């Protein structure tokens, strides 16, 4: 249950690839680090579809192997959007095994522990400062077997510290499929 | 107390200097405007060390004269990292004052009043939009006489209005050594 970062492109790369909308880059992993021109965050590939926060993504297209892809799913209120995963992209398999012990992968590959404290909440074991989570929305929370449970949507912060998190239940990703 | 920004590199410069990790540029001033392929934040040298927030820097090396400077101190759980100051590097001194009257300096050189609200908490006299503080984590939280009391981490905001800050105190920086 480790995870490590890997850059595939530099700024010049985001820039030209956001302009031409075309990405000849091989998709590998599960969790992707993505970027727009004003912020960066993650995207988790589940059930053959790339999920991410509407707050980071908006209505934007995803650069693809054959040109830019249009979001095929969008739910502005539940802050989640998805693009059909480009052919030849790995995808996580859902959980539903009751485990309350969840681990979320941040943008630097830090597997930080969270206890499910609700339907879309999860108690944060080591209350990190909120700044710590910045740029990690869109990332997964897995159950002890490594299967997906949701997408880190935002931070439940108490004036400084983040002692719990909000995520899109994988169930609310399926009612939209 | 006033500060002013100065740009030292354009697009071509960050990209090449980030590839090689070779920055033969002479460092000046106490706070550095740093950027990665995605974000652009700030860094403050306090008593010999170029400090910054871990969410921005990850575990990347700083671009240095001798080449890539692997970082020295790292308290990820406090979202902190720092590198051994490069040649010249005008460091800042810790607090001494007790003064609860701080000032936050932004990436545009905005000396903005904050009131020491705790070990790491701090009130902003006049709230501004959270876009105002974008790209400033890593910046300094000074005292009346200009001493480094803390490295700015993130704004505390509700409804797009930022009214408080969350910083790491100069004292926990030293506790790291």
């Amino acid at each position: 249950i480790t995870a490590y970062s890997q850059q595939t492109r530099g700024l010049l790369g985001c820039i030209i690839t956001s302009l031409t909308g075309r990405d000849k880059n091989q998709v590998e992993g599960e969790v992707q680090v993505v970027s727009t021109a004003t912020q960066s965050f993650l995207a988790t590939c589940v059930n053959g579809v790339c999920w991410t926060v509407y707050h980071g993504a908006g209505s934007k297209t995803l650069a693809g192997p054959k040109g830019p892809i249009t979001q095929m799913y969008t739910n502005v209120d539940q802050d989640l959007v998805g693009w059909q995963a480009p052919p030849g992209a790995r995808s996580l398999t859902p959980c539903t095994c009751g485990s309350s012990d969840l681990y979320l992968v941040t943008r630097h590959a830090d597997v930080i522990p969270v206890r499910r404290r609700g339907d879309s909440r999860g108690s944060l074991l080591s209350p990190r400062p909120v700044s710590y989570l910045k740029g990690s929305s869109g990332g997964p929370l897995l159950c002890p077997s490594g299967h997906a449970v949701g997408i880190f949507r935002a931070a439940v912060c108490t004036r400084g510290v983040a002692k719990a998190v909000d995520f899109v239940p994988v169930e609310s990703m399926e009612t939209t499929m | 107390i006033t500060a002013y920004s100065q740009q030292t590199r354009g697009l071509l410069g960050c990209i090449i200097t980030s590839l090689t990790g070779r920055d033969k540029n002479q460092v000046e001033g106490e706070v550095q405007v740093v950027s990665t392929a995605t974000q652009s934040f700030l860094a403050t040298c306090v008593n010999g060390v170029c400090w910054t927030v871990y969410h921005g820097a990850g575990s990347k090396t700083l671009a240095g004269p001798k080449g890539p400077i692997t970082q020295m101190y790292t308290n990820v759980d406090q979202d902190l990292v720092g590198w051994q100051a490069p040649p010249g590097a005008r460091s800042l001194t810790p607090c001494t004052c007790g003064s609860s009257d701080l000032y936050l300096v932004t990436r545009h050189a905005d000396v903005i009043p904050v009131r020491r609200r705790g070990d790491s908490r701090g009130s902003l006299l006049s709230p501004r939009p959270v876009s105002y503080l974008k790209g400033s984590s890593g910046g300094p939280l000074l005292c009346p006489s200009g001493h480094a009391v803390g490295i700015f981490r993130a704004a505390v905001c509700t409804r797009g209005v930022a009214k408080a800050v969350d910083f790491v105190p100069v004292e926990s920086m030293e506790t790291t050594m």
């Binding site: 249950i1 995870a3 970062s5 969790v31 992707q32 934007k60 297209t61 650069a63 490594g146 | -």
Partner: peptide
């Protein structure tokens, strides 16, 4: 402009 994958995060 599009959203671009600038990196990946390998699980185990």
């Amino acid at each position: 402009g599009s959203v671009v994958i600038v990196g990946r995060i390998i699980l185990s």
